[PDB]
Amino acid sequence: TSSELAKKSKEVFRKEMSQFIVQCLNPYRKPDCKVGRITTTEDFKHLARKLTHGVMNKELKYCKNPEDLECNENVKHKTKEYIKKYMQKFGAVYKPKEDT
């Protein structure tokens, strides 16, 4: 049932994860963020979207069956760790035009 299960699971996942990523990015949008400080809300939102999309794509590659495409613990783990490591490339400020 995973073709349709996943229709709903990807949107739910991407939503959960966008919220989780949003939560994760929250300290970065703060004016005293040392690393990967998010410039603007639009950038914050764009990045949250983008990160959701990259976690999603990478696991869709290494999972292939979206019955497991969930913003689960494993995924969260991978995500927030990915996020940190990701934002470390921006430097002080988040500069997506100089992103990977």
Swiss-Prot record:
Reported effect, residue 22 to A: Impairs interaction with hyperphosphorylated POLR2A
Modified how: May be automethylated.
Compartment(s): Nucleus; Chromosome
Chain spans, region Interaction with POLR2A: 1-100
Effect of residue 20 to A: Does not affect interaction with hyperphosphorylated POLR2A
Highest taxon above the source species: Eukaryota
Entry comment describing in which tissues the protein is expressed: Ubiquitously expressed.
Effect of residue 44 to L: In AML; uncertain significance; somatic mutation; impairs interaction with hyperphosphorylated POLR2A
Phenotype upon changing residue 45 to A: Impairs interaction with hyperphosphorylated POLR2A
Disulfide bonds: none
Disease linked to the protein: Renal cell carcinoma: Renal cell carcinoma is a heterogeneous group of sporadic or hereditary carcinoma derived from cells of the proximal renal tubular epithelium. It is subclassified into clear cell renal carcinoma (non-papillary carcinoma), papillary renal cell carcinoma, chromophobe renal cell carcinoma, collecting duct carcinoma with medullary carcinoma of the kidney, and unclassified renal cell carcinoma. Clear cell renal cell carcinoma is the most common subtype.
Domain text: The low charge region mediates the transcriptional activation activity.
Family in the record: Belongs to the class V-like SAM-binding methyltransferase superfamily. Histone-lysine methyltransferase family. SET2 subfamily.
Function: Histone methyltransferase that specifically trimethylates 'Lys-36' of histone H3 (H3K36me3) using dimethylated 'Lys-36' (H3K36me2) as substrate. It is capable of trimethylating unmethylated H3K36 (H3K36me0) in vitro. Represents the main enzyme generating H3K36me3, a specific tag for epigenetic transcriptional activation. Plays a role in chromatin structure modulation during elongation by coordinating recruitment of the FACT complex and by interacting with hyperphosphorylated POLR2A. (Microbial infection) Recruited to the promoters of adenovirus 12 E1A gene in case of infection, possibly leading to regulate its expression.
Complexes and interactors: Specifically interacts with hyperphosphorylated C-terminal domain (CTD) of RNA polymerase II large subunit (POLR2A): binds to CTD heptad repeats doubly phosphorylated on 'Ser-2' and 'Ser-5' of each heptad. Interacts with HTT. Interacts with IWS1. Interacts with p53/TP53; leading to regulate p53/TP53 target genes. Component of a complex with HNRNPL. Interacts with TUBA1A; the interaction is independent on alpha-tubulin acetylation on 'Lys-40'. Interacts with STAT1.
Protein name: Histone-lysine N-methyltransferase SETD2
Native species: Homo sapiens
Lineage: Eukaryota, Metazoa, Chordata, Craniata, Vertebrata
Full protein stretch here: 2462 to 2561 of 2564
